[PDB]
Design a protein around this ligand. Structure first.
Ligand SMILES: [Mg+2]
Ligand SMILES: [Zn+2]
Ligand SMILES: [Zn+2]
Lengths: 330, 331
């Protein structure tokens, strides 16, 4: 069996639909008359051209069959987060998007699973949408590491993760591209540099703030893309904790001891990096993800994990075993 | 078979009143206590950082080197001394002053203490002149910061400076400083833990992805601090993006991973699995032992991580001594 817990979709909306939310700030799908090709737009302009497999659940069950992929977990493309929008507006938007997600999943609920998006800017609306969308069939939630243009240390954020831990709602955290602001303007430097750094920051912020000593152990939380640069830079973080007062201030154990409080996906695009990742997190805490169906997504889903020299026991937890437990999937 | 540490810092005996003449708020100076074993780097009347004697006392430092089995240490300015935001002429006088201090520091024992120079990088012409002057006077190379405000290493001015050093056979160490982030990562030393390895990665990728290595002569000897930051680990993600996205291929003719033959990194990565990955990405010829001595987060036992890693003995030899002897021309 083979579960891919990192993949994305974008609903078949309309330019007019989106306008009633926002005509030049709300995304929408523009499939051309030629329907095996399209684009995501905002108003007049083109945000992003995209493969058909982003929509069309049957078209996807096709690709999932070519690859050895049985169960896919899919979630919102980051464009639709609306974390910068008005709280009740975004709540309405998240509802619609989450409804679209189930539609997309409805094509085949046994092999296509969905996570929901939430209005993360407002605690109460977020908890509410989290609970609602899960009751309606979502296996969990995907949230951003950012929040529009956000400093990611709020105590409402602990409140939120605690709500999810209590309701047995698993969480996937997925990065944004913003940190160096007006540097990194070329060559997708935001994806190559800013994002892995933002993800490391989201993790360390939970660790070094002592959040894990307050969030119940029942919390199931996973960080996309191998947790960014976290695994590689862990040694430096542990060194700092050991030799500097201010690093220990709110975090009573060594930072590397908290790896048992979270998961990461396997999307690190390199054998050596995967080995190191597994060594750091353990074979129980890494889940296969592909970022499907994007160009950057791994071409042979699971190819990396399979091609490695990890134990056969290890390869199985990563390709199926862990995601089964995490998302409660058969 | 000299054991060489190539990443270390010094700070000169500068008085508050001397530093005031350059900048009453932003020029760093050194305040030493009464017993004289400890002190602080200061900035205006503000305390900047606690330090100890090894930073400013070459005699004391030699004793510590003796106790660590370090035969030769290459040392350079503490990055707070860079002054990249100052008015160019003033920064050029500062650099020459600091560079003379460095040589006086090394003059205690120039067989075991080597120095790299700083340059007024905000003015290309003055930077090039200072680089050449300092190396002529006995510096083995230059240490620079990894960016100048919003100018990364791919900026025409920085590529121009690098080309000058390549043509003059002046080795370069690139050190992170003035980390990105803003108001986002103040506490728990996050700028050191997050922004700095990303800054270093960004510096390396800026050279690679802009095609600057196609334009800079192969004779350039350039080393990046702290193992290249998170560069080695994220290099799969970069090669993938290059393979499947055109705007990434734009100015970079070969796959990014192939440009590892154009630079070096130090070994300060605080973890043996990390160091092993580094060496497999870079090659055993392109990693040099550096410790960040004498700062608190510096390696407590110098070379200790390298000796305790799974690397072959020949790789260990190169990392500990051979690579730096060749890079800095130490003999
Ligand atoms: Mg610029
Ligand atoms: Zn993704
Ligand atoms: Zn340093």
């Amino acid at each position: 069996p083979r579960i891919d817990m990192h993949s994305h979709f974008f609903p078949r909306i309309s330019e007019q639909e989106a306008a009633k939310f926002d005509a030049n700030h709300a995304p929408w799908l523009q499939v051309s008359a030629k329907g095996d090709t399209g684009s995501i737009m905002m108003g007049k302009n083109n945000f992003r051209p995209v493969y058909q497999a982003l929509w069309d659940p049957a078209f996807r069950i096709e690709e999932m069959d070519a690859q050895g992929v049985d169960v896919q977990v899919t979630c919102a493309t980051p464009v639709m987060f609306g974390y910068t929008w008005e709280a009740n507006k975004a709540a309405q938007w998240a509802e619609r998007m989450n409804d679209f997600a189930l539609e997309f999943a409805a094509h085949n609920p046994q092999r296509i699973k969905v996570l929901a998006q939430v209005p993360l800017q407002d605690l109460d609306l977020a908890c509410k949408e989290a609970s609602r969308a899960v009751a309606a069939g979502h296996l969990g939630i995907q949230i951003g590491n950012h929040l529009g243009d956000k400093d990611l240390d709020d105590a409402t954020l602990e409140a939120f993760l605690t709500h999810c831990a209590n309701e047995d709602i698993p969480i996937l955290v997925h990065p944004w591209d913003m940190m160096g602001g007006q540097r990194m303007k070329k060559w997708m430097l935001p994806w190559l540099v800013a994002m892995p750094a933002e993800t490391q920051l989201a993790i360390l912020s939970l660790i070094l703030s002592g959040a894990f000593e307050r969030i119940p152990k029942s919390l199931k939380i996973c960080f996309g893309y191998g947790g960014g640069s976290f695994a590689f830079l862990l040694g430096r973080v542990d060194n700092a904790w050991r030799h500097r007062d201010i690093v220990r201030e709110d975090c009573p154990r060594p930072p590397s001891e908290y790896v048992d409080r979270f998961f990461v996906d396997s999307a690190v695009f390199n054998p050596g990096a995967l080995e190191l990742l597994v060594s750091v997190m353990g074979e129980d805490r890494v889940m296969l993800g592909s970022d499907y169906p994007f160009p950057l997504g791994e071409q042979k889903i699971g190819g990396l994990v399979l091609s490695s020299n990890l134990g056969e026991s290890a390869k199985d937890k990563i390709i199926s075993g862990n995601a089964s437990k995490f998302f409660n999937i058969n």
